[PDB]
Amino acid sequence: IRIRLKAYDHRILDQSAEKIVETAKRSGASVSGPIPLPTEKSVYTILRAVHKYKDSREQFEMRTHKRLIDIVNPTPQTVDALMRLDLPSGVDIEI
């Protein structure tokens, strides 16, 4: 079964993905590896000052990234054990 996950920090997302694959493996399932789906940046621009000096500027980025997993066999007797995992709020998860 396909499963998609994303977050704002690779630091949380990598441990999330590794935990997912490990609990899918030790609780037997046939699985594909955590391919990193290419990240997408999103730049923002803003004046330093409140009233003047448009030549002054600083840049902000909502740098976000994506990973992808899929389980080859749904394995109903173990995916139901997989579902009850808990992760930080920094990561999104969906079918």
Binding site: K6, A7, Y8, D9, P88, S89, G90, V91, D92
Partner: protein, 206 residues
């Protein structure tokens, strides 16, 4: 031309956002209610004092963790009061919420708590000289590596304002490896407006 905010620069590389939730298509309203609950709890806990509050999202259920040892005293006597206030957060957020209290041991090296201390000492008519010179050494012997603290406004000499700062220690702001925690606070006085900026060098990160 002034300096960049140090924690503003250090966020996301050596510091976490203190809002650890992902959203998408709900980012705006999630953010808005985050500011609303921040404002509410800061306003109604200012007397007990609190530095920083993190917010966390799960299944549309918000959950919180709140800092400082004084909300520790709010645990016991205010244990009823904790439920009483979090009822208000439930009402505001619509969906019910969870909270946690974490005790900041050694409050002498929390930037926001120090700033609030200075603000109170200023607003109850104590001299900036005594307040600041005492607090710096308090934090230093509390065990920081370096401190710089600054106040500005009509400093007694009401007819004209000026700037002043004390410091003793090592405090590298240009290095992006230090742990320079930063805070600022506003103190309203009869003879004008007083602002405070305090930051402390705790240590490097490895």
């Amino acid at each position: 031309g002034q300096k960049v905010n140090p924690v503003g620069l250090r966020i996301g590389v050596i510091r976490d956002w203190e809002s650890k939730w992902y959203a998408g298509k709900d980012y705006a309203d999630f953010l808005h209610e985050d500011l609303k609950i921040r404002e509410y709890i800061s306003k109604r806990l200012s007397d007990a004092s609190v530095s920083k509050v993190e917010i966390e999202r799960a299944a549309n259920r918000v959950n919180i963790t709140i800092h400082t040892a004084k909300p520790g005293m709010v645990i016991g006597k205010g244990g009823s009061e904790v439920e009483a206030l979090r009822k208000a957060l439930n009402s505001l957020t619509g969906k019910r919420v969870h909270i946690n209290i974490l005790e900041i041991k050694r409050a002498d090296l929390d930037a926001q708590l120090v700033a609030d201390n200075i603000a109170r000492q200023l607003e109850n008519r104590v001299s900036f000289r005594r307040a600041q010179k005492q607090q710096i050494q308090r934090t230093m012997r509390a065990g920081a590596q370096g401190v710089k603290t600054m106040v500005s406004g009509r400093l007694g000499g009401a007819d004209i304002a000026r700037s002043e700062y004390y410091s003793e220690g090592t405090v590298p702001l240009h290095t992006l490896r230090a742990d320079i925690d930063y805070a600022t606070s506003e103190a309203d006085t009869t003879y004008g407006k007083l602002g405070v900026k305090v930051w402390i060098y705790r240590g490097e990160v490895l």
